[PDB]
């Protein structure tokens, strides 16, 4: 009978980077979409595998949320079947995923006036990401032809760089908070339910 | 031209401070983002932390409360506070610099730091 923690995940304070995205599992409650469908705050609301009217008719197990910061260019690698930084080395969704990514700008909560430099994003990885694979590995890598034995070859490659985000940015640079919603369809006992 | 130096090195109890200075020199110490790495004897290198113009501090997930990057940019300099002090943490210290507009390269290097811990 009670309610999901929805507000605990969409109007919190403080988000994760993209590299070390935060995961919620959301289980033992009642969740109305209602309330995130009908509401105009969010630009992109793309659902795969189910829609999102019927999001309140279905009963799910083991909803999990998603949540982190990319800039605006990037939600379109939100999805499944799409290449880029944060698909191959950031966050990966798999080909049959279903479930719904949710983005909405950020600019006046995550821009300050001399540049924000909390989010982060991996520029690279040896190999691209499985679904749903987070790395926080921080690790130096190497460049090329030379080991990273010290300074003595060529200088050494820095994996997580930082977003530019300024509040004079054009859209597209601009701070987008997505908060991926994955679910799975009738299993076990259902544990989220809509009304 | 540019330069990296850094001091605070010596033969230290265990337990006690340290403080690490890298001080730069020939270039605006803006628009850059500054790191801590290490190396110890018979290892290869490993990142400690980052620091940007905002002050955010980025840490390593494998250490955790040992170390604290604290930027000042009045005089372009960069400190290190490291707190309770293992044997583990005998190490040759580097300073680095990325560019912010840029991929993730460390360009120039700090000439490096002996931290030597001993009992
Ligand atoms: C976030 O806060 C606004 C403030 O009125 C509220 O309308 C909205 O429903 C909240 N979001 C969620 C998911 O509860």
Same mark, same amino acid.
């Given at each position: 009978?009670?309610?999901?923690?929805?507000?605990?995940?969409?109007?919190?304070?403080?988000?994760?980077?993209?590299?070390?995205?935060?995961?919620?599992?959301?289980?033992?409650?009642?969740?109305?979409?209602?309330?995130?469908?009908?509401?105009?705050?969010?630009?992109?609301?793309?659902?795969?595998?189910?829609?999102?009217?019927?999001?309140?008719?279905?009963?799910?197990?083991?909803?999990?949320?998603?949540?982190?910061?990319?800039?605006?260019?990037?939600?379109?690698?939100?999805?499944?079947?799409?290449?880029?930084?944060?698909?191959?080395?950031?966050?990966?969704?798999?080909?049959?995923?279903?479930?719904?990514?949710?983005?909405?700008?950020?600019?006046?909560?995550?821009?300050?006036?001399?540049?924000?430099?909390?989010?982060?994003?991996?520029?690279?990885?040896?190999?691209?990401?499985?679904?749903?694979?987070?790395?926080?590995?921080?690790?130096?890598?190497?460049?090329?032809?030379?080991?990273?034995?010290?300074?003595?070859?060529?200088?050494?490659?820095?994996?997580?760089?930082?977003?530019?985000?300024?509040?004079?940015?054009?859209?597209?640079?601009?701070?987008?908070?997505?908060?991926?919603?994955?679910?799975?369809?009738?299993?076990?006992?259902?544990?989220?339910?809509?009304? | 031209?540019?330069?990296?130096? #850094?001091?605070? !090195?010596?033969?230290?109890?265990? +337990?006690?401070?340290?403080?690490?200075?890298?001080?730069? &020199?020939?270039? *605006?110490?803006?628009?850059?983002?500054?790191?801590?790495?290490?190396?110890?004897?018979?290892?290869?290198? #490993?990142?400690? !932390?980052?620091?940007?113009?905002? +002050?955010?501090?980025?840490?390593?997930?494998?250490?955790? &409360?040992?170390? *604290?990057?604290?930027?000042?940019?009045?005089?372009?300099?960069?400190?290190?506070?490291?707190?309770?002090?293992?044997?583990?943490?005998?190490?040759?210290?580097?300073?680095?610099?990325?560019?912010?507009?840029?991929?993730?390269?460390?360009?120039?290097?700090?000439?490096?730091?002996?931290?030597?811990?001993?009992?």
């Amino acid at each position: 009978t009670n309610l999901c923690p929805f507000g605990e995940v969409f109007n919190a304070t403080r988000f994760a980077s993209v590299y070390a995205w935060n995961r919620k599992r959301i289980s033992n409650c009642v969740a109305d979409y209602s309330v995130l469908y009908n509401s105009a705050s969010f630009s992109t609301f793309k659902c795969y595998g189910v829609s999102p009217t019927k999001l309140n008719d279905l009963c799910f197990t083991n909803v999990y949320a998603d949540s982190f910061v990319i800039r605006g260019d990037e939600v379109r690698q939100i999805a499944p079947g799409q290449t880029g930084k944060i698909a191959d080395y950031n966050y990966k969704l798999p080909d049959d995923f279903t479930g719904c990514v949710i983005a909405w700008n950020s600019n006046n909560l995550d821009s300050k006036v001399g540049g924000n430099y909390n989010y982060r994003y991996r520029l690279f990885r040896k190999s691209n990401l499985k679904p749903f694979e987070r790395d926080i590995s921080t690790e130096i890598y190497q460049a090329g032809s030379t080991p990273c034995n010290g300074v003595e070859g060529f200088n050494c490659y820095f994996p997580l760089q930082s977003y530019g985000f300024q509040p004079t940015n054009g859209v597209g640079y601009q701070p987008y908070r997505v908060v991926v919603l994955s679910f799975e369809l009738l299993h076990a006992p259902a544990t989220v339910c809509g009304p | 031209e540019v330069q990296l130096v #850094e001091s605070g !090195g010596g033969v230290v109890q265990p +337990g006690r401070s340290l403080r690490l200075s890298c001080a730069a &020199s020939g270039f *605006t110490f803006s628009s850059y983002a500054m790191h801590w790495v290490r190396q110890a004897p018979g290892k290869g290198l #490993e990142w400690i !932390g980052n620091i940007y113009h905002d +002050g955010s501090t980025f840490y390593n997930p494998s250490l955790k &409360s040992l170390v *604290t990057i604290s930027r000042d940019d009045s005089t372009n300099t960069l400190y290190l506070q490291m707190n309770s002090l293992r044997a583990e943490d005998t190490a040759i210290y580097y300073c680095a610099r990325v560019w912010l507009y840029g991929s993730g390269y460390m360009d120039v290097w700090g000439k490096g730091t002996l931290v030597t811990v001993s009992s």
